Design a protein around this nucleic acid. Structure first.
Ligand code: SF4
Lengths: 85, 73
DNA sequence: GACCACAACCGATTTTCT
DNA sequence: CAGAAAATCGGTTGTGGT
């Protein structure tokens, strides 16, 4: 439960955007990935992955995607990184 | 609350053309949340996108997004 | 050495100016 | 017409900091 609806908004991103956040927060297998590893999967450098991740997080913060979803597991950390501390 | 951004496709607010951003910016004018949206986005220094009816670029407001080629004079 | 934030830089492409 | 110039874009490199 709930874990599903965010998987919905993830599906509103491009594959690379979604996969980068999936890997960063270890959403599919519990294990967060390092920027380097992520770059290894998408064939780009770590810094490119960092830029992608910054912009994608900006998108996820945006009400168009985040408003429906305002209600130590990785999904917990993702929702936390969306909003404040 | 019902927001204008939450209907349609959200990438409009992160559109690559200045046209799409102007569209989203006028869509925001009907938002019951607008001034909030803007304040909070400024206070997180958003890198891009349209928030509270304004284009953001690396944490500030840009008014109009530059087109892709050389500037007309 | 592992990890990553920041800025400068790079080649391609696009657009406009002379 | 033909370049040259200026700008964005997706990406990498270089530097340095925990
Ligand atoms: S004010 Fe905020 S919620 Fe309303 S349309 Fe603009 S960005 Fe979306």
């Amino acid at each position: 439960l709930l874990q599903d609806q965010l998987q919905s908004v993830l599906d509103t991103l491009s594959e690379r955007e979604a996969g980068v956040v999936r890997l960063r927060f270890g959403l599919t297998d519990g294990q967060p990935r390092t920027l380097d590893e992520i770059g290894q999967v998408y064939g780009v450098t770590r810094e490119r992955i960092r830029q992608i991740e910054s912009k994608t997080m900006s998108k996820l913060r945006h009400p168009s995607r985040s408003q429906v979803l305002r209600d130590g597991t990785p999904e917990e950390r993702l929702l936390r990184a969306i909003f404040g501390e | 609350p019902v927001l204008p951004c939450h209907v349609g496709d959200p990438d409009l607010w992160f559109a690559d053309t200045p046209a799409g951003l102007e569209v989203a910016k006028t869509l925001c004018v009907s938002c019951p949340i607008r001034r909030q949206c803007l304040a909070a986005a400024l206070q997180r220094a958003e890198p891009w996108g349209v928030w509270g009816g304004e284009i953001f670029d690396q944490g500030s407001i840009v008014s109009h997004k530059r087109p892709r080629g050389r500037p007309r004079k």
